[PDB]
Design a protein around this ligand. Sequence first.
Ligand SMILES: [Ca+2]
Ligand SMILES: [Ca+2]
Ligand SMILES: [Ca+2]
Lengths: 124, 124
Amino acid sequence: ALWQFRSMIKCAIPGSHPLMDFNNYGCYCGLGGSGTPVDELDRCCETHDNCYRDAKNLDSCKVLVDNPYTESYSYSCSNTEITCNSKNNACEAFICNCDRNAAICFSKAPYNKEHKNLDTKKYC
Amino acid sequence: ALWQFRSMIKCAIPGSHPLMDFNNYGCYCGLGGSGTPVDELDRCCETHDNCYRDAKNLDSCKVLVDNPYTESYSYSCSNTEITCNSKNNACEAFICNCDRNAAICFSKAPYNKEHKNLDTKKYC
Ligand SMILES: [Ca+2]
Ligand SMILES: [Ca+2]
Ligand SMILES: [Ca+2]
């Protein structure tokens, strides 16, 4: 669930303010995604968006989960490392994974303040 | 999640058709619940209805869980026994239990074919 994803980003990026820093950044980080991602951080959001789309194609996600952004999974934050519980169901494990990889992705991408709140009709 | 509860009913009552047999039975098995339950099977539905109402008032569920009929959990069916997996968080464990106790409840109550499709306006 989204609240878990916000906590994974604080895990990997201590002292980050997830909603404030990464929402509405470039063409993909936020409600939609269209156009060409404008940097490596936007590309992280674009993969996370496709990750969620692919999860919805799994049979497991179809019968068991309604909304990925609301579905709680099991993961842990050890120090700065994220781990998805091996005992999560197959749909929960796929979501957990998408989130884990995005979080690790954001921790290595450079942040471009200029891309924050970019006009999505103009540039995307 | 509802698909999981249907599955636990077929675990405990091998060969039942959960929607066909248990939906729209007495006063509580179905969308609503009002009145006095008409029999033991109906009291199972009633308890499961209250179970979920309590689930919602659980802090970890309270704010952190969208809707309990939607949240997926981990459980397993061994032969005819249901087990809620220990990986589940407070919210999911609570849900899985509401579900597990109802399926066991159903497996033990007597079924009055005469209460299937009881007029809810008239009798509840
Ligand atoms: Ca997006
Ligand atoms: Ca009911
Ligand atoms: Ca779950």
